[PDB]
Amino acid sequence: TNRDQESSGFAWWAGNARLINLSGKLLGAHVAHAGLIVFWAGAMTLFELAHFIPEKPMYEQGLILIPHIATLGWGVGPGGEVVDTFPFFVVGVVHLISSAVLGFGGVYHAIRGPETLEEYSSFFGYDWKDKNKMTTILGFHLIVLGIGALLLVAKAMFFGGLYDTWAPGGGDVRVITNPTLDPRVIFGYLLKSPFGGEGWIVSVNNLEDVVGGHIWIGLICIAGGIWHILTTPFGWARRAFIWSGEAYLSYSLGALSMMGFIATCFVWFNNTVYPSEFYGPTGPEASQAQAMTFLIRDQKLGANVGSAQGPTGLGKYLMRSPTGEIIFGGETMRFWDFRGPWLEPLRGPNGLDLNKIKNDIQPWQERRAAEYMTHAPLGSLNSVGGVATEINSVNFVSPRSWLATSHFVLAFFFLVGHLWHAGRARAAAAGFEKGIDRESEPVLSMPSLD
Amino acid sequence: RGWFDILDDWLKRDRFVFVGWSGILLFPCAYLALGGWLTGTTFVTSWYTHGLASSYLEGCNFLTVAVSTPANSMGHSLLLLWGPEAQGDFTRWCQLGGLWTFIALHGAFGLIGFMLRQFEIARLVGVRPYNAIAFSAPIAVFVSVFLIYPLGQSSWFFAPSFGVAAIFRFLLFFQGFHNWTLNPFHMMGVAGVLGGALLCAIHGATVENTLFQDGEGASTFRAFNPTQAEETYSMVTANRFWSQIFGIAFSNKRWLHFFMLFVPVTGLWMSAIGVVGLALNLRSYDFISQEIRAAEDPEFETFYTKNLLLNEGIRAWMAPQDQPHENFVFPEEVLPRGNAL
Amino acid sequence: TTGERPFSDIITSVRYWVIHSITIPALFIAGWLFVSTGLAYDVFGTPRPDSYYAQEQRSIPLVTDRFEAKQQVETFLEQLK
Amino acid sequence: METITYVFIFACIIALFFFAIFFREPPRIT
Amino acid sequence: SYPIFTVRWVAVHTLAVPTIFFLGAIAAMQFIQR
Amino acid sequence: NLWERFCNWVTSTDNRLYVGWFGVIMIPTLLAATICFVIAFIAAPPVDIDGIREPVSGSLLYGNNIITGAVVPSSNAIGLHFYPIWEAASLDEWLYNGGPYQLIIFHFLLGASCYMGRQWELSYRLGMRPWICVAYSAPLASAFAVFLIYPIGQGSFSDGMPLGISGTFNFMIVFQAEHNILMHPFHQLGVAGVFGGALFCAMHGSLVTSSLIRETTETESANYGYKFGQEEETYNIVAAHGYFGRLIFQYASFNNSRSLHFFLAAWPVVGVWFTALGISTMAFNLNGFNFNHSVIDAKGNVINTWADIINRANLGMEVMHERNAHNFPLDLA
Amino acid sequence: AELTPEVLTVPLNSEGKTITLTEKQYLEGKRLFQYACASCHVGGITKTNPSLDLRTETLALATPPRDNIEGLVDYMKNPTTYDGEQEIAEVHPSLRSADIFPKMRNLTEKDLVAIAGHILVEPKILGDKWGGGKVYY
Ligand code: CLA
Ligand code: CLA
Ligand code: CLA
Ligand code: CLA
Ligand code: CLA
Ligand SMILES: CC1=C(/C=C/C(C)=C/C=C/C(C)=C/C=C/C=C(C)/C=C/C=C(C)/C=C/C2=C(C)CCCC2(C)C)C(C)(C)CCC1
Ligand SMILES: CC1=C(/C=C/C(C)=C/C=C/C(C)=C/C=C/C=C(C)/C=C/C=C(C)/C=C/C2=C(C)CCCC2(C)C)C(C)(C)CCC1
Ligand SMILES: CC1=C(/C=C/C(C)=C/C=C/C(C)=C/C=C/C=C(C)/C=C/C=C(C)/C=C/C2=C(C)CCCC2(C)C)C(C)(C)CCC1
Ligand code: OEX
Ligand SMILES: [Cl-]
Ligand SMILES: [Cl-]
Ligand SMILES: [Fe+2]
């Protein structure tokens, strides 16, 4: 049965390693785990909805899943205001039911179905060292991922659109009719620097680029899936990789760690696919909002904000970036690359325009600045809003903080897991994962260093 | 045989819990110290000694409970229950901080009993007593910090209170008032502690990654026999690995394990010496040349001068509440602060 | 190995649970009633939530003399806590 | 003279690093 | 066969009896209102 | 074939220091970072770290000593912008804005990641088990947290840890002021990791030294009783297990040396993993526990705790840190 | 010290009439304050304008006086500047600007009375801590 240490070589704390060469039970483990994921999605959505106050902003209510559905244009109107709550309920309920179905399948294949799929079928039975079968399964899953990307495209283009925080008038659910299919624009994001001002693919700032990139990634994933169904790994690929289950797991672990770090930076910096109406302001957004708020207040009191000198000699409200752009002064000089829909009407060719600052600041911009200043993504582990020195009065930690922290923890641990499994796959393929053979110790056959 | 020999035979009998002659000192004192800490953090306030809530009964959590030190006006009183301050009143004794002196003294004699236990068991089983010698460093730390440091100061009040957030207060107090990070003895202590953690991790990983294959199971923990005569890992392979990775490597196992003894013990002893220096307020607070230059030149700035400004902030902003016996009334206009914030 | 019954043999015995389904809840109830009747406040001198301050005071009852500290605490408690 | 002292001690440490790595006692298996 | 009251019994109960008493006390504390 | 000969030299186990391909990346980056660090620590001009035209002197030639000297982080005006030498108009502008810090930290992070990879590589070439690099991933994660991840979360490389002793102390104190790291459970796990690592290091060393088998006289050192490459164990693990099992109780003592050494590896590595994650999660401003004004009496008066005293100390550091850099009431980043 | 009815007695209007809030009224007032006002008025200070606070003396010197229940409820309905010359409902939460400040949409007059009572009672409990800022933390 391979369910003890003696017959399998693995202790109980590595007991899932007993599933490596048992395709049916491994499939059961995977399907049950997918059921767990869908279960969390549905149950968490229903939990969030049950404690959802529609007239309070989503980022004040500890919501991470409802903002995702809102970003898809479901249940929201202009300005991010919730107009209907039933789409959130539908998403949660359908995930809960589908998770029951997936849990049934996982349990069946894990404890009742055949332990190996090779005798039952040749289509579903696989060997880890059969490279063509591995590429065939990879191709099937690439086609599925491409269809998912095209499903996002279909939602954006034909099924109501997406929430656009950059939409003219204040942000609204908009149908994307002209996606950016230009490969220079799309693949210019991939060759952009990850550093300040550039920000790589995290810096995508319009839904047209998002939909065009998703068209490209859906078509590329479908094409690569067909490629791997039709082809076999080449000689350089066969010589460059370890071909085993733990090796493929380690490759996926490295990929997932990289994706986790990317998602952390995406939720921390991007306010386009993570609109600040739903997720709250970013840190740069909140700092710029504080500078804007006190600029407005002192300008109302009569200060000449263009000529006001701070304690150090720099501009108290307005200064210059290292490349000359007129930016907000103070420590928020670090955040001068921030772009937001509430701040862009005041920005001219040379940065913040003094004339627009003096007479074009509207009350909605001031309300947005005050709201984003007082909902900065700073909070305690017990969810006390503000800096670490604040007193207990405000129950607030930003969803951006929760998502970024959790996915950095997960991405780092998955990098560690990738290192573990990559080293172990190399050692097991080379044949010394269980230790050094006493009779054939390699170092004893090597010349001395000195 | 005699009553002494029969009693010695009983005390040294093999049990689940060894007692020994040292047990008579260890088990009462250690049990009372632990029970006093739990009793204090569960039921006893600091309202009359510090003006603080410090028990679960007052609504504090595990991080914020403490058995606080006695009030400053008590001085270095032993604060015995029958002593002239409490006069046998257990309730007043708890309210006056007598539980702190109870825990501190019972803990000191419990640590003495534990090192005597180490010596006694080492003598009984026939091993060298290097564990007691290693345990001298925690005893030195406890004596320097909880006994020598308040004895140098005005009272028991400035000793650490037995609690998590109270110990954090002790850390921040030493930063603000002593500049304890700048003290080279504390630097040697940090070096010893972090080097001991490094040596622990690196030696464990090196042993686990140079194991001989002594079994067919993938989980290698089964392959070790406690009574086997052979080494369970390859010292030659480990030496070559670290020689080619780091440049230098251990080649003597006995020297390796003595070094693992030596590093954190020496670090803790150096930090205890520094704590005695701080008991007399003999701080490594300032570099005189940098002070002279910064005083005569308002453009000279280092991270050390910034740390001094931070220490001034710590002292001014925490002194009225951390030292309520001084009756510090600092008006808002005398508080040092930067622009805005 | 030391001549005592193993813990697994004891805590899986019915006799142990016959004793301890009585003794463990009795101690739990004893501690619960020690708090809920207010005996802990009297034994340890811990202020009740209405006992930190007199109604109009904001100063803290800090002891300032070593040998009359008991009298100072009794004076502080006499001032309607 | 203080800067010279610090740099001199650091340089002696680096020289000791060189001698400890490349002119060590060679570990001989026995 | 096995003696019931030993040194181990004494150590175990001197740790366990006040532990359950204190756990009951703190559990009662959780419902205290100001 | 020349490329085959170069590959054989690079992966050779007969080199005095192993190179490997992780080494062909590691050696130039670490040499560049080391040379730039020594030159900057000795002779760099003062650096405007806060971006407020108040340069901080960090090198020995400009009035520092070993304790107070540092390589000062790049300017707050730079923020997260990439600032190589060729992006400056001159070297004097590059030195004024803190370019050496960026060069050193980027080269050091690349070199240290390749050091981890090189540890794996040599373990693979020698037929070892491969997880020494996993143990080294904990200090590497700590270095990434303090040099890269905290600047990324705060939005400026000026908030990264300075390359010096007193600058490190400044980093610690300001971090406690703004994030209450002491009250964060991940840092408490890290303190448990390092304290336990020192404890178990001293414990394992003292237990092995205690149980050393007599192979010498009182005249000679006990270390000469061990010979390099001997098959027999130099100490009696049964005697040490008997001692430690009588010290606490028997089942608290390891009798398996492999399990014991795995525990020695695992405790500080997991603790330092959690404290590096603590620094990263406070970089995204998920701060330590806030218990300020948590204990409230019947009337509503605040009853102070030790957390409130910590809050007073944190307030002192907060109001005094970067005393000229703030124009607005909230220190958002 | 307890939450006595003498503590919960605050001036109702500018004439001199007073109102004794119940303990439940004070608790609901504090809850509503945390729900709608505390993100900028935590502890009695004003985050987006620290020159003004919620101390009783500052509210008394406001035009019209805001150191009573009726004045505070009127401010919650029609907020003005400190001298009362300019209406600021477009940038301050109010019953009239509940469209743009949605947390004011379901606030009854009894809720406004509870918030006003909490604002007027908290200085009497906290001393200089209310509207005093980080100096008094
Ligand atoms: C996502 C988590 C997950 C999943 C999917 C699995 C799945 C599996 N593990 Mg496993 N495992 C896990 C976590 C998980 N494990 C953890 C955390 C540990 C460490 C403690 C282990 C330790 C471990 C060991 C030591 C072994 C396995 C084995 C197995 C396989 C056979 C199970 C078996 O025979 O159980 C039999 C058990 C039962 C029949 C008891 C009932 C269990 C059912 C499934 C519970 C279902 C509950 C659910 C509410 C039902 C919903 C139904 C509804 C949808 C209609 C199976 C594929 C074995 C293996 O490799 O097989 C060769 C094996 O030896 N595991
Ligand atoms: C998709 C990801 C993935 C997959 C499929 C695997 C699969 C596997 N891993 Mg692996 N691993 C991963 C990620 C993954 N890992 C990551 C991210 C790390 C880094 C932490 C590791 C580190 C790791 C080690 C160190 C080892 C494995 C091993 C194994 C094998 C046996 C596992 C087993 O039985 O677990 C049994 C499960 C448990 C014992 C439970 C662990 C409990 C976790 C650590 C606590 C979770 C805390 C929770 C999230 C938060 C609190 C919850 C609350 C209850 C308190 C199996 C092939 C073993 C191996 O090499 O076998 C060949 C092995 O020794 N893994
Ligand atoms: C990754 C998922 C996955 C995979 C690879 C398999 C694979 C297999 N299952 Mg299995 N199963 C699954 C999920 C899965 N199942 C789930 C979720 C359930 C619960 C309903 C079951 C219940 C189940 C039973 C009861 C039995 C199997 C059997 C089998 C084997 C033969 C099936 C066959 O010939 O299909 C032939 C092909 C078809 C029937 C076509 C089906 C078309 C589907 C319904 C359309 C799905 C659309 C889309 C791709 C799904 C997206 C889902 C996503 C949104 C979550 C094969 C090894 C049989 C077996 O092992 O017998 C020995 C068997 O008796 N399965
Ligand atoms: C989940 C996705 C996935 C996975 C796992 C694979 C897996 C594989 N593919 Mg593949 N492929 C995919 C999607 C995927 N494919 C798609 C969508 C397409 C269509 C565009 C292709 C098209 C494709 C072709 C045309 C070929 C493969 C090949 C291979 C095999 C060798 C991989 C290899 O050495 O590359 C590792 C990567 C390299 C060797 C490139 C050099 C490494 C550089 C320096 C890395 C630079 C990136 C760096 C990390 C920075 C990131 C940012 C950057 C993008 C700017 C392997 C089985 C080969 C094969 O054997 O075919 C049968 C092959 O010739 N793939
Ligand atoms: C053997 C273990 C042990 C040890 C070393 C200590 C040690 C101590 N306890 Mg302690 N204690 C113990 C067990 C122990 N305790 C137990 C089991 C209990 C529970 C009953 C207590 C309960 C307890 C309380 C409640 C208090 C202490 C306190 C103290 C400290 C001061 C005691 C003192 O001055 O008396 C010194 C007395 C002696 C050394 C005895 C002298 C014996 C010699 C032979 C002389 C005998 C003379 C003659 C035969 C009889 C007297 C003559 C007559 C005229 C009076 C001291 C550090 C006090 C404290 O911590 O203050 C903060 C305190 O208040 N203890
Ligand atoms: C193999 C194995 C395992 C695992 C398992 C799993 C993982 C499973 C899964 C499972 C699952 C995954 C399940 C699920 C289920 C679900 C269900 C059964 C559901 C149902 C639902 C309902 C009933 C609904 C309801 C409702 C609605 C309609 C709406 C409103 C609300 C409510 C909720 C009421 C373990 C680890 C134990 C170990 C051993 C073996
Ligand atoms: C614009 C846009 C977009 C798009 C994007 C895209 C289109 C992407 C793609 C991307 C891609 C296309 C990617 C790729 C990547 C790659 C990688 C990640 C690689 C890796 C590699 C490896 C891992 C290798 C390795 C190696 C070496 C180095 C040497 C030898 C050995 C081996 C082989 C191992 C989106 C959707 C966002 C939306 C928004 C906008
Ligand atoms: C002072 C005094 C005394 C003493 C007493 C005693 C000795 C007591 C004891 C007491 C005790 C002896 C108590 C106990 C307690 C305990 C508790 C209260 C516990 C709790 C626990 C828990 C809650 C758990 C936790 C944990 C851990 C730690 C970790 C992780 C996991 C868990 C969560 C499970 C005498 C009379 C002599 C004299 C007078 C004075
Ligand atoms: O740069 Mn370095 O330390 Ca982070 O918080 Mn904002 O920025 Mn500044 O103040 Mn606080
Ligand atoms: Cl600073
Ligand atoms: Cl600022
Ligand atoms: Fe060892």
- Work out the widest C-alpha separation in chain G, in whole angstroms: 42
Task: Compute φ and ψ for B151, nearest 5 degrees.
Answer: -65, -35
In angstroms, rounded to a whole number, what is the distance separating the alpha carbons of residues A308 and A61?
39
According to DSSP, residue B68 is labeled: P
Decide: F290 and F180 in contact? Cβ < 8 Å: yes
Decide: A424 and A246 in contact? Cβ < 8 Å: yes
Q: Which residue, among G24, G20, G116, G128, has the nearest Cα to G68 in the 3D structure?
A: G116
Structure-block tokens of residue F8:
């054989």
Which residue has the least CA distance to atom 9 on ligand 9? F331
List the subunits that have 3+ CB pairs under 8 angstroms with D.
A, B, F
The residue written with tokens 């204990």 in the block is: F295
- Tally of CB atoms within 10 A around F8: 10
In angstroms, rounded to a whole number, what is the distance separating the alpha carbons of residues G23 and B88?
42
According to DSSP, residue F321 is labeled: T
Give 3-state DSSP helix, strand, coil % of chain G, rounded to 5: 45, 5, 45
C-alpha count within 13 angstroms, C-beta hemisphere, residue F264: 31
Decide: A18 and A10 in contact? Cβ < 8 Å: yes
Taken in order of first residue, the domains within chain G and their CATH numbers are: 2-137 (1.10.760.10)
Which residue has the least CA distance to atom 37 on ligand 2? A13
Helix (H) or strand (E) holding G18: strand G18-20
State the sign of the Cα–Cα–Cα–Cα dihedral B32, B35, B38, B41: negative
- Tally of CB atoms within 10 A around G84: 12
User: Quick check: G3 and F311 CB within 8 A?
Assistant: no
Residue F141 three-state SS: helix
Structure-block tokens of residue F38:
């020594």
In angstroms, rounded to a whole number, what is the distance separating the alpha carbons of residues B34 and E15?
10
The yes or no reply on domain C5-81 and CATH 1.20.5.860 is: yes
Tell me whether strands B162-163 and A379-380 are parallel, antiparallel or unpaired: unpaired
Flag whether C touches G (3+ CB pairs, 8 A cutoff).
Answer: yes
List the subunits that have 3+ CB pairs under 8 angstroms with F.
A, B, C, D, E, G
Q: Which residue, among F63, F64, F60, F55, has the nearest Cα to F43 in the 3D structure?
A: F60
CA A94-A98-A101 angle, to 5 degrees, is: 150
In angstroms, rounded to a whole number, what is the distance separating the alpha carbons of residues A191 and A199?
10
- Tally of CB atoms within 10 A around B179: 21
Decide: F247 and F203 in contact? Cβ < 8 Å: no
The residue written with tokens 């010349």 in the block is: A447
List, as one string, the DSSP characters of G72-104.
HHHHHHS-B-TTSSSB-TTTS--STTTTTSGGG
- Determination technique for this entry: cryo-EM
- Ligand nearest the Cα atom of residue A259: 7
In angstroms, rounded to a whole number, what is the distance separating the alpha carbons of residues B16 and E12?
11
Decide: F295 and B59 in contact? Cβ < 8 Å: yes
Which residue has the least CA distance to atom 18 on ligand 7? A255
G118 annotated binding-site participant: no
Residue C41 three-state SS: helix
User: CB-based burial of residue A380 (10 Å sphere; 0-12 exposed, 13-18 middle, 19+ buried)?
Assistant: buried
Interface check A255 vs F, CB under 8 A: no
Contacts of B256 in chain D (CB under 8 A): none
Helices and strands in chain C: count of H runs, count of E runs? 4, 0
Q: Can you name the residues that pair with F302 across neighbouring β-strands? A: F296
Going by C-beta distance under 8 Å and a sequence separation of 6 or more, which residues neighbour residue A381?
A: F184, F185, F286, F287, F288, F289, F290
Task: Compute φ and ψ for A82, nearest 5 degrees.
Answer: -75, 120
Decide: A128 and A60 in contact? Cβ < 8 Å: no
In angstroms, rounded to a whole number, what is the distance separating the alpha carbons of residues G63 and G70?
13
The residue written with tokens 């990641």 in the block is: F113
Structure-block tokens of residue B118:
């180490």
Decide: F66 and D6 in contact? Cβ < 8 Å: yes
Q: Can you name the residues that pair with A404 across neighbouring β-strands? A: none
In angstroms, rounded to a whole number, what is the distance separating the alpha carbons of residues A339 and A362?
18
B252 → chain D, closest CA residue: D27
The rounded Cα G36 to chain-centroid distance in angstroms is 11
In angstroms, rounded to a whole number, what is the distance separating the alpha carbons of residues A210 and A220?
15
User: Quick check: G2 and C55 CB within 8 A?
Assistant: yes
Structure-block tokens of residue A260:
């986790």
In a mutational test of the F interface, the residue from B22, B227, B257 whose CB has the highest number of chain F CBs within 10 Å is B257
In angstroms, rounded to a whole number, what is the distance separating the alpha carbons of residues A294 and B107?
56
Task: Compute φ and ψ for G106, nearest 5 degrees.
Answer: -105, 30
As a whole number of Å, the end-to-end CA separation of chain B is 78
Which residue has the least CA distance to atom 6 on ligand 8? B35
Structure-block tokens of residue A27:
């499939």
What CATH code is assigned to A281-376?
1.10.10.670
Select from B211, B236, B339 the Cβ nearest to the Cβ of A435. Answer: B211
Structure-block tokens of residue G24:
């439940």
Q: Which residue, among A284, A265, A192, A272, has the nearest Cα to A411 in the 3D structure?
A: A265
CATH superfamily, with its number, for domain F2-179 = Photosystem II protein D1-like (1.20.85.10)
The rounded Cα B330 to chain-centroid distance in angstroms is 33
Decide: A201 and A190 in contact? Cβ < 8 Å: yes
The rounded Cα A409 to chain-centroid distance in angstroms is 13
In angstroms, rounded to a whole number, what is the distance separating the alpha carbons of residues B160 and F191?
18
Q: Which amino acid is at B101?
A: T
The residue written with tokens 């495209």 in the block is: A153
Q: Please give all residues whose beta carbon lies within 6 A of any atom in ligand 4, as ranges.
A: A 135, 138, 142, 190, 220-221, 223-224, 227, 231, 233-234, 237, 240
Q: Work out how many CB contacts closer than 8 A connect A with F.
A: 220
- Tally of CB atoms within 10 A around F34: 15
In angstroms, rounded to a whole number, what is the distance separating the alpha carbons of residues A338 and F156?
13
User: CB-based burial of residue A258 (10 Å sphere; 0-12 exposed, 13-18 middle, 19+ buried)?
Assistant: middle
Task: Compute φ and ψ for F71, nearest 5 degrees.
Answer: -95, 110
Interface check C76 vs G, CB under 8 A: no
Contacts of B240 in chain A (CB under 8 A): 443, 446, 449
Q: Classify residue E20 as left (phi > 0), alpha (psi -120 to 50) or beta.
A: alpha
Interface check G110 vs F, CB under 8 A: no
- Tally of CB atoms within 10 A around B334: 8
In angstroms, rounded to a whole number, what is the distance separating the alpha carbons of residues F115 and F130?
14
Interface check E15 vs C, CB under 8 A: no
Structure-block tokens of residue A194:
């990850």
Distance A137 CA to ligand 6 centre (A): 27
Helix (H) or strand (E) holding A105: helix A86-107
User: Quick check: A393 and G42 CB within 8 A?
Assistant: yes
CA G107-G110-G114 angle, to 5 degrees, is: 95
Q: Where are the alpha helices (DSSP H) in F180-322?
A: 185-210, 237-247, 257-283, 306-320
Task: Compute φ and ψ for G53, nearest 5 degrees.
Answer: -135, -170
Contacts of D3 in chain B (CB under 8 A): none
Going by C-beta distance under 8 Å and a sequence separation of 6 or more, which residues neighbour residue F174?
A: B310, F317, F321, F322
CA A326-F52-B312 angle, to 5 degrees, is: 145
What are the domain boundaries of chain A? 3-280+377-450, 281-376
Rg for chain B, CA atoms, rounded? 26
What are the domain boundaries of chain C? 5-81
- Taking the CA of residue A216 as reference, the ligand 7 atom at the shortest distance is 7
In angstroms, rounded to a whole number, what is the distance separating the alpha carbons of residues A174 and A168?
10
In angstroms, rounded to a whole number, what is the distance separating the alpha carbons of residues F202 and F197?
8
C-alpha distances in Å from residue G87, one per residue of A87, A351, F297, G72, G112? 40, 32, 40, 15, 19
Structure-block tokens of residue B2:
């005699």
In angstroms, rounded to a whole number, what is the distance separating the alpha carbons of residues F127 and B236?
12
Contacts of A449 in chain F (CB under 8 A): 14, 16
Q: Where are the alpha helices (DSSP H) in F126-210?
A: 132-144, 150-154, 165-179, 185-210
Contacts of F16 in chain D (CB under 8 A): 21-22
The residue written with tokens 């790049």 in the block is: F74
In angstroms, rounded to a whole number, what is the distance separating the alpha carbons of residues B302 and F72?
9
In a mutational test of the B interface, the residue from C1, C32, C58, C63 whose CB has the highest number of chain B CBs within 10 Å is C63
CA F33-F37-F39 angle, to 5 degrees, is: 120
List the subunits that have 3+ CB pairs under 8 angstroms with G.
A, C, F
- Tally of CB atoms within 10 A around B32: 18
Contacts of D18 in chain A (CB under 8 A): none
Question: Which residues of B are known binding-site members for a plastoquinone?
Answer: 203, 250
User: Quick check: E28 and C33 CB within 8 A?
Assistant: yes
Which residue has the least CA distance to atom 1 on ligand 2? A253
Q: Which residue, among F116, F99, F100, has the nearest Cα to F26 in the 3D structure?
A: F116
Q: Where are the alpha helices (DSSP H) in A231-310?
A: 235-240, 245-269, 276-279, 283-301
Distance B104 CA to ligand 5 centre (A): 14
Resolution of the experimentally solved model in angstroms: 2.2
Contacts of B45 in chain C (CB under 8 A): 44-47
- Tally of CB atoms within 10 A around C26: 14
Q: F150-180 burial, b if ≥16 CB within 10 A, otherwise e?
A: bbbbbbbbbbbbbbbbbbbbbbebbbbbbbb
Helix (H) or strand (E) holding A319: strand A318-320
Select from F16, F65, F229 the Cβ nearest to the Cβ of D29. Answer: F229
In angstroms, rounded to a whole number, what is the distance separating the alpha carbons of residues D18 and B247?
9
Q: Classify residue F288 as left (phi > 0), alpha (psi -120 to 50) or beta.
A: beta
Structure-block tokens of residue C18:
């016959």
Structure-block tokens of residue B263:
């590093």
Select from C52, C55, C58 the Cβ nearest to the Cβ of G4. Answer: C55
Q: Classify residue A387 as left (phi > 0), alpha (psi -120 to 50) or beta.
A: beta
DSSP strands (E only) in chain B = 66-67, 162-163
In angstroms, rounded to a whole number, what is the distance separating the alpha carbons of residues A215 and F136?
42
E29 → chain B, closest CA residue: B57
Q: Which residue, among A287, A371, A268, has the nearest Cα to F284 in the 3D structure?
A: A268
DSSP strands (E only) in A125-178 = 162-164, 172-174
C-alpha count within 13 angstroms, C-beta hemisphere, residue B320: 19
In a mutational test of the B interface, the residue from F142, F208, F248, F305 whose CB has the highest number of chain B CBs within 10 Å is F305
Which residue has the least CA distance to atom 39 on ligand 4? A237
Which residue has the least CA distance to atom 15 on ligand 8? E19
Structure-block tokens of residue B139:
């005893």
Distance, in angstroms, between D28 CA and closest chain F CA? 7
In angstroms, rounded to a whole number, what is the distance separating the alpha carbons of residues B92 and C31?
22
- Tally of CB atoms within 10 A around D1: 4
The CB-based long-range contact list for E16-21 (8 Å cut-off, 24+ gap) reads E17/C27, E18/B35, E18/B38, E20/C24, E20/C27, E20/C28, E20/C31, E21/C27, E21/C28, E21/C30, E21/C31, E21/C34
In angstroms, rounded to a whole number, what is the distance separating the alpha carbons of residues A86 and A67?
14
The residue written with tokens 């971006």 in the block is: F51
Question: Which residues of F are known binding-site members for chlorophyll a?
Answer: 107, 187
Residue F235 three-state SS: strand
List, as one string, the DSSP characters of B291-321.
HHHHHH-TT---HHHHHHHHHHHHHHHHHHH
In angstroms, rounded to a whole number, what is the distance separating the alpha carbons of residues B209 and B201?
12
Q: Can you name the residues that pair with B66 across neighbouring β-strands? A: B163
Distance, in angstroms, between D4 CA and closest chain A CA? 35
In angstroms, rounded to a whole number, what is the distance separating the alpha carbons of residues A28 and A89?
29
Residue F107 three-state SS: helix
According to DSSP, residue D27 is labeled: P
Going by C-beta distance under 8 Å and a sequence separation of 6 or more, which residues neighbour residue A282?
A: A268, A269, A270, A271, A276, A338, A377, A400
Q: Can you name the residues that pair with F47 across neighbouring β-strands? A: F56
- Tally of CB atoms within 10 A around B230: 12
- Cis amide linkage into residue A349, ω under 30° from 0: no
Q: Please give all residues whose beta carbon lies within 6 A of any atom in ligand 2, as ranges.
A: A 13-17, 249, 253, 413-414, 416-417, 420, 424
- Ligand nearest the Cα atom of residue F211: 12
Going by C-beta distance under 8 Å and a sequence separation of 6 or more, which residues neighbour residue G53?
A: G44, G45, G46, G131
User: Quick check: B137 and F246 CB within 8 A?
Assistant: no
Question: Which residues of B are known binding-site members?
Answer: 106, 118, 131, 186, 203, 250, 257
User: CB-based burial of residue A359 (10 Å sphere; 0-12 exposed, 13-18 middle, 19+ buried)?
Assistant: exposed
In angstroms, rounded to a whole number, what is the distance separating the alpha carbons of residues F96 and F82?
15
C-alpha distances in Å from residue B189, one per residue of B184, B268, F315? 9, 5, 28
- Tally of CB atoms within 10 A around G119: 28
CA G48-G49-G51 angle, to 5 degrees, is: 155
Structure-block tokens of residue F273:
């993993």
Q: Where are the alpha helices (DSSP H) in B44-129?
A: 90-95, 98-125
- Taking the CA of residue A20 as reference, the ligand 2 atom at the shortest distance is 57
Task: Compute φ and ψ for F31, nearest 5 degrees.
Answer: -65, -45
